[PDB]
Amino acid sequence: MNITDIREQFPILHQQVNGHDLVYLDSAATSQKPRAVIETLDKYYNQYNATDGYEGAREKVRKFINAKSMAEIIFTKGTTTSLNMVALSYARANLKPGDEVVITYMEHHANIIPWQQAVKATGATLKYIPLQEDGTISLEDVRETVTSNTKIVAVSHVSNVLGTVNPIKEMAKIAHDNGAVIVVDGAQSTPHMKIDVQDLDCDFFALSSHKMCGPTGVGVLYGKKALLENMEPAEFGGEMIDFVGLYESTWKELPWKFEAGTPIIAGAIGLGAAIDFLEEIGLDEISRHEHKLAAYALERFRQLDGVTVYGPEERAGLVTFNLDDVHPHDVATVLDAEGIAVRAGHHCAQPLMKWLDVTATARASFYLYNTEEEIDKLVEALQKTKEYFTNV
């Protein structure tokens, strides 16, 4: 895998910011898109037929995560919408008082609140697997937290703050043994490593196109055919209908049952081209590149005095940290001045922020186009920043 060849593909990396080269370290929020993807979306904003392309893209998505059937690949507005859908069509119809839903402390808001509302409405109860010191889950902890009263476990595959890769294959086993389905938020895993939903045996899996070189506006919700068959739709209109009566309507078959309103043609075809691209590079190749960057970043961050890093040693390609004494918003500002783009904030993980005893953090995240030289620029600029602020 050749980083020059790859970088040539992202016109945005040639952008100057304030006389410096863009150093783009916010992929966890949005990847950039290569020329192949860009050209594809340009094509679908001139004149067309289209649905060869649309269903073709569903097929590429299905093969990509190794789903058994296209009936199991639904296009949605985003991973937030995906998770809300499972909470409304699956959770609200399968929970009764006494039933438990268990999640983790590391979750995105969209993987917390929909379960909260589903539990309030059904009068069931919500439960949290506790975290280890280093921000990991242990299989012991899940084993203990899941009762044979647990109907749903929901978990991030990769944490967007800690970079922890959760043992989701094993958690699936533990959920099944207790009579539960597992719901996996794969927003942060799918861009960076092979996903095989059969081997993971997750019951639902959600991915975000804009994190994986595709357009925004488009997510995919995977669910097992059999679960999807019994779920009622969350949204109504457009093209999810078979017969519309005056009082009564019938739904289409899967997957179209779940796609109300106006098909996101360009977005899906775009996601498909993004998939074509990543596959031609190899996800394994990508993942090895990210392990190097992450080991490198964590080592060089240990050289810096009074910066805290959060999470485990083994990690996806991101590190969340704080400068002693300095506000993360301020760090982000100064790095911006130098053309270095990191994100500051709570990362829609308020619970987890409280758990780390912090109100905010900065985050640098890495993808297939980042390099060690960029990590050096980050470390040098963090140094320059610690000095610059101990001096006011």
Ligand X SMILES: Cc1ncc(COP(=O)(O)O)c(/C=N/[C@H](C(=O)O)C(C)(C)S)c1O
Q: In the chain, which residue ranges form alpha helices assigned H by DSSP?
A: 3-7, 35-43, 51-65, 79-85, 113-122, 139-145, 168-177, 197-200, 225-230, 265-281, 283-302, 328-337, 350-356, 372-390
> Rounded to whole angstroms, how far apart are CA atoms 184 and 155?
5
**d(Cα 305, Cα 290) in Å, to the nearest integer?**
25
Among 238, 299, 329, 388, binds a copy of itself (CB under 8 A): 238
Told to check if 298 binds ligand X by CB under 6 A, we report no
∠ CA 142-308-312, rounded to 5°: 30
Quick one: what does residue 122 bind among a copy of itself, ligand X, none, with the CB cut-off 5 to 8 Å set by partner type? none
Site for a copy of itself in 321-380 (CB under 8 A): 341, 348, 350-351
164 binds, among ligand X, a copy of itself, none (CB under 5 to 8 A by kind): none
**Of residues 261, 285, 329, 359, which one binds ligand X by CB under 6 A?**
261
Give the x-and-dash track for 218-257 against ligand X (CB under 6 A).
Answer: -x--------------------------------------
Cα distances (angstroms) measured from residue 148 to each of 101, 140, 170, 177, 336: 11, 15, 16, 8, 50
Choose which of 70, 227, 241, 334 interacts with a copy of itself (CB under 8 A).
Answer: 241
Contacts 24+ apart (CB under 8 A), 44-52: 44/265, 44/266, 44/269, 44/270, 45/266, 50/265, 51/263, 51/265
Q: Which of 34, 78 has the CB closer to ligand X?
A: 78
Q: Choose the contact partner of 147 out of a copy of itself, ligand X, none; CB within 5 to 8 A by kind.
A: none
Q: Cα(192)–Cα(367) distance, rounded to whole angstroms?
A: 8
Number of other residues whose CB lies within 10 A of the CB of residue 368: 28
Partner whose footprint covers residue 335, from a copy of itself, ligand X, none (CB < 5 to 8 Å by kind): none
Using CB under 8 A as the binding rule, the residues of this chain from 209 to 228 that contact a copy of itself are 216-217
Query: How many amino acids of this chain bind ligand X (CB under 6 A)?
Result: 18
Residue 143 lies near a copy of itself (rule: CB under 8 A): no
Active site residue 348: yes
Cα-based distances in Å from 253 to 38, 99, 173, 241, 340: 32, 30, 29, 9, 48
Task: Name residues contacting ligand X, limited to 150-169 (CB under 6 A).
Answer: 156, 160
Query: What's the min distance (Å) between Cβ of 279 and ligand X?
Result: 21
- Structure tokens given for 349: 């993980």
Residues forming the site for a copy of itself (CB under 8 A): 12, 15, 17, 22, 24, 33, 45-47, 77-81, 83-84, 87, 108-114, 116-117, 119, 126, 128, 216-217, 235-239, 241, 243-244, 246-249, 260-262, 264, 266-267, 341, 348, 350-351
State the catalytic residues. 348
